[PDB]
Amino acid sequence: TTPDRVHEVLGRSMLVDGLDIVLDLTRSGGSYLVDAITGRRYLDMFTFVASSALGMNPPALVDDREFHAELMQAALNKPSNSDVYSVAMARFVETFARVLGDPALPHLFFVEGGALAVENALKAAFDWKSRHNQAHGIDPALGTQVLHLRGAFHGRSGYTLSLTNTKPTITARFPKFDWPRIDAPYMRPGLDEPAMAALEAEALRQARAAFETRPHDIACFVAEPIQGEGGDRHFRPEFFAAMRELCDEFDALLIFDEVQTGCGLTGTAWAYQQLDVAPDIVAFGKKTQVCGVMAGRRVDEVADNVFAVPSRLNSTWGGNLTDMVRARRILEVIEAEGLFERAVQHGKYLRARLDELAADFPAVVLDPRGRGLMCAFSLPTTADRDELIRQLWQRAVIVLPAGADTVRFRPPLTVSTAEIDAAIAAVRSALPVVT
Amino acid sequence: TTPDRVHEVLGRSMLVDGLDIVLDLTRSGGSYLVDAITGRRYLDMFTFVASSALGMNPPALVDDREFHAELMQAALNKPSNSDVYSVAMARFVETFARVLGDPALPHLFFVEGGALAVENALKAAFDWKSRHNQAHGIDPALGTQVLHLRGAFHGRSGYTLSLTNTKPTITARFPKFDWPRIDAPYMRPGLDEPAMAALEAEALRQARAAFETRPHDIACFVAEPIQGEGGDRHFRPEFFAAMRELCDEFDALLIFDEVQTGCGLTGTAWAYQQLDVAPDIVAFGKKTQVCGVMAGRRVDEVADNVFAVPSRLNSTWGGNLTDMVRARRILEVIEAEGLFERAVQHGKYLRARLDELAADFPAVVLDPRGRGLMCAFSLPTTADRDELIRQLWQRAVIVLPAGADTVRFRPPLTVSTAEIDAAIAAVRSALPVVT
Ligand SMILES: Cc1ncc(COP(=O)(O)O)c(CN)c1O
Ligand SMILES: Cc1ncc(COP(=O)(O)O)c(CN)c1O
């Protein structure tokens, strides 16, 4: 079966709605995907939906003969890491703790898949609230609800479909829990400090009313520190600091979903580190390859929590051992090459170019925004946004849409300024055509 | 970090409740796990909880230099197969369809994780019932419930926690939907045809009453064809044939969860093939490495079902490409070496040995049973069962418990009769000690 027959073969069994290219696994490299059909190179600002930290075939992995042997040993089999431990797994865990660890969150748990990472954070919270309730004479049947935001995306699994609310297509006709949802007071152009503060006060009022009308029954508040799929919506640290206080006042855990923000993209290991808000639990995935949760802070106050009692959380495999070995090596490159700092510096560069674009196309390039390499702008209409994406595709630049009118950039941490310039040049060429 | 330090390093971050050994990834082979600490060999009747078809480091994979190159190409990166297609992926899909495919179930969907496989089958059913309802003038808000069995295990995710009901530890303190659950009329010793028929009639009565009291709101019936975690409980084909008819009478889909039964273990590609009941959807995982669903039969009667409409089902990765490449090679070995037939023949051998054991230890070795290599027996008490497992561990044989009093065998498809003899000899040595 040949590159030119891939879509035909897949189309017999599945809906084939992905990209027109066929990925060349060998010739792709760095910020470039290679189409196996034509040999055309595509500038990658999409990175498998933000899940690739170093891009394709990074030299540090590709040339490391010792790593090849370690990776191959892992890749031949697929152990259940839940039951059976290995050196390969232990090395991953200790380097994870070293590079991405937070001393307040010592408990680690791994699973395949970002939605399941968020679910296990929820399960930890449900268990914690029920037991905390029980310990203070409150009915342990209470503590089953999740406070969350409008525009959130946390996955497409049984619990996360009750939280995710972006496009109706994602959630329609699937059963849901009736959990409290509050407005998202994200930053927008032409609102100053007082205007933002009033927007936040209204979301906070809603949050407080949820807690007061469902007493002892809200186990946690969950949020993306920056909403990704819903449209790269950013929040002031003030908003989360207030939410932190409100969670503590009502004995509820604060969970950040860093599946999309995490692992260096914003310039630090985790976005929450720049907002100066301490979560009780963090869900991670995508760039970490293996998914999971880190937990601590108030979790520890319930001594028989899910991290302390066997068999409360589990899966057959406990994450994919191949992903752990790959992730271990990727983390070592990040640490060795100072890639978080490189994300800060190139993120400032990309953001500066987007500011310039906005200045040159004031009516068209709206709300340029970002934190580190997580950057975006918006268009007047969704028709303009969709056309811009098509025009970029024609120019061999891959970007992702988000929300109704956003174009998002998800470059690899190793992106160069010349590559950023090439992406910007394409947007510049395309814009007069969409107008 | 050295084998003797693995448990210490992991114990800083996680609850370490798995096996005392450290897996040697290189020296393990076939039906044997090697402890890296001692070099002791362990006879493996556990196979990473039934997820390894060929055992460790199969020669057909290990010696295949061309496959090594293909596997390495996949293992270095982790593409989002949802969006970006490859030759490696297309080869996997066409060999899956060839070796495991059913012509009535042409729609394939892949995801990481067995619980999420079952969830996507449920989502297909919820969507189908709502749309089928809508098409016949019934409120499309109806079709949100799942008929299922007592003793079922379908996973630990948001929807499957509402179905799974084995140990209370798995589900306690987690929110659940109130879905209808019926008695499981499994085969037991000392019930003849009439006695079984009466047991089945009672479960069927309960099923019928669920359908009649929740009109148009039950989207599907889900079952394991043989209940695994709940205790290797087997059902007559008559029971499922009746359920098939009842599902059709109430316009509900029949889904089989073959995550544990699937991929040759019972002697055929899928257990349902031996029961002569046609499902609408099958969830698979474990031995297939990549998880997912096959769907068809009545699914197709709703033209805008989730397999036909973009973005109704999704995940970031669409399954792990490394797992797809590994699984492709494993399927080729199964097909080339006739391993399904080998499972039938060695499964008969293992079952015959268990019958002999029961004859020699009538009061102790209870209810020997199996289909193909999926075999089990029970003990008088859970204390006896737990002690037998400890005694086998001491003799370097790994088996799994199930339910309150079952010991289960999950050998690889490539197990030899000498290896089965060694497992049986160990049980024979251990039994006088537990009595
Ligand atoms: C913030 C966030 N949380 C969770 C998920 C779900 O991750 P996965 O697709 O691996 O289930 C996503 C995926 N885009 C996400 O962006
Ligand atoms: C029948 C069945 N269904 C689903 C699952 C869940 O699979 P996973 O652990 O990969 O989520 C299991 C796991 N033992 C199972 O046995």
- Provide the 8-state DSSP code for A174: S
Name the residue of chain A whose CA is nearest to B176's CA: A177
From the CB of B259, is ligand 2 less than 6 Å away? yes
**Is the shortest distance between the CB of B325 and ligand 2 below 6 Å?**
no
What are the tokens at A22?
């066929």
Number of H helices, E strands in chain B: 14, 16
User: Are residues B136 and B146 both part of a single domain?
Assistant: yes
Per-residue CA distances from B223 to B187, B211, B217, B399 (Å): 15, 16, 18, 24
State the residue range of the domain holding B373.
Answer: 1-57+339-435
B172 with B320, same domain?
yes
Distance, in Å, from the CA atom of B106 to the CA atom of B118, rounded to the nearest integer, reads 17
Closest CA to B408 of B37, B46, B20, B35: B46
Task: Choose the final residue of a domain: B283, B310, B338.
Answer: B338
In this structure, the number of other CB atoms found within 10 A of the CB of residue A402 comes to 22
- Claim to verify: residue A324 and residue A368 sit in the same structural domain: no
> Nearest residue of A to residue B26 by CA position?
A73
- Beta-carbon contacts below 8 Å between A and B: 299
The burial of B238, by beta-carbon neighbours within 10 Å (0-12 exposed, 13-18 middle, 19 or more buried), is given as middle
Cβ within 8 Å, pair B326-A76: yes
**C-alpha Rg value of chain B to the nearest Å:** 22
The alpha carbon of A328 and the centre of ligand 1 are apart by a number of angstroms equal to 21
Cβ atoms of residues A311 and B170 within 8 Å: yes
Mark whether B202 and B330 lie in a shared domain. Answer: yes
Chain A CB contacts of B3 below 8 Å:
87
Q: Which residues of A make up each annotated binding site?
A: 114-115, 156, 260, 408
B12 and B51 housed in the same domain: yes
Number of domains in chain A: 2
Q: Identify residue A68 by its one-letter amino acid code.
A: H
* A126 burial via Cβ count (<10 Å: 0-12, 13-18, 19+): buried
Is the beta carbon of B226 within 6 A of some atom in ligand 2? no
CATH number at residue A52: 3.90.1150.10
Q: Which of residues 10-49 of A touch B (CB under 8 A)?
A: 10, 12-19, 21-23, 25-26, 28, 33, 36, 48-49
Q: Please give the method by which this entry was determined.
A: X-ray
The reply, when asked if residue B188 is annotated as ligand binding, is: no
Helix, strand, coil % in chain A, rounded to nearest 5? 45, 15, 40
Q: Does A293 share its domain with A370?
A: no
Residue A374, classified by CB atoms within 10 Å of its CB into exposed (0-12), middle (13-18) or buried (19+), is buried
Largest CA distance in chain A: 68
How far does the centroid of ligand 1 lie from the alpha carbon of residue A49, in Å? 9
Token pair belonging to A248: 């503590």
B113 in ligand 2 pocket by Cβ < 6 Å?
yes
Q: Does B170 touch chain A (CB under 8 A)?
A: yes
Are A399 and A357 within one domain? yes
Pairwise CB contact (< 8 Å): A73 & B6: no
Instruction: Write the CB contacts of B33 (distance below 8 Å, at least 6 apart in sequence).
Output: A84, B21, B23, B24, B41, B42, B44, B56, B398
Q: Are B80 and B335 in contact (CB under 8 A)?
A: no
Asked if B134 has any chain A CB less than 8 Å from its own CB, the reply is: no
Q: Which residues pair with A107 in a beta bridge?
A: A295
**Residue B167 and residue B234 share a domain:** yes
Q: Are B176 and B265 part of one and the same domain? A: yes
A67 and A1 within one domain: no
Beta pairing partners, B107: B295
> Which CATH number is A247's domain given?
3.40.640.10
Kindly state whether residues B264 and B165 are assigned to the same domain: yes
Shared domain for A39 and A185, answered yes or no, is: no
CA distance B352 to chain A (A): 30
- φ and ψ at B25, to 5 degrees? -75, -25
Q: Of B338, B353, B386, which closes a domain? A: B338
Residue A278 in tokens:
């301490």
Q: Within 10 A of B58 (CB to CB), how many other CB atoms are there?
A: 21
B76–chain A Cβ distance below 8 A for any pair: yes
> Is A85–B6 a contact, with Cβ atoms under 8 angstroms apart?
yes
List the structure tokens of A103.
């001393």
Q: Which residues of B touch A126 (CB under 8 A)?
A: 173-175
User: Where a domain ends, among A314, A338, A362?
Assistant: A338
Helix and strand element counts for chain A (H, E): 14, 16
Distance of CA A50 from the midpoint of ligand 1 (Å): 10
Mutation target among A8, A48, A52, A400 for the B interface, most CBs of B within 10 A: A48
Q: Rounded to whole angstroms, what are the CA distances from B197 to B191, B206, B220, B256?
A: 10, 14, 23, 22
Is the CB of B260 within 6 Å of ligand 2? yes
* Residue B287 Cβ < 6 Å to ligand 2: no
| Residue B202 in tokens | 């009672």
Binding-face residues of A in 106-125 toward B, CB within 8 A: 106-109, 111-116, 119, 123
CA of A148 to the centre of ligand 2 (A): 29
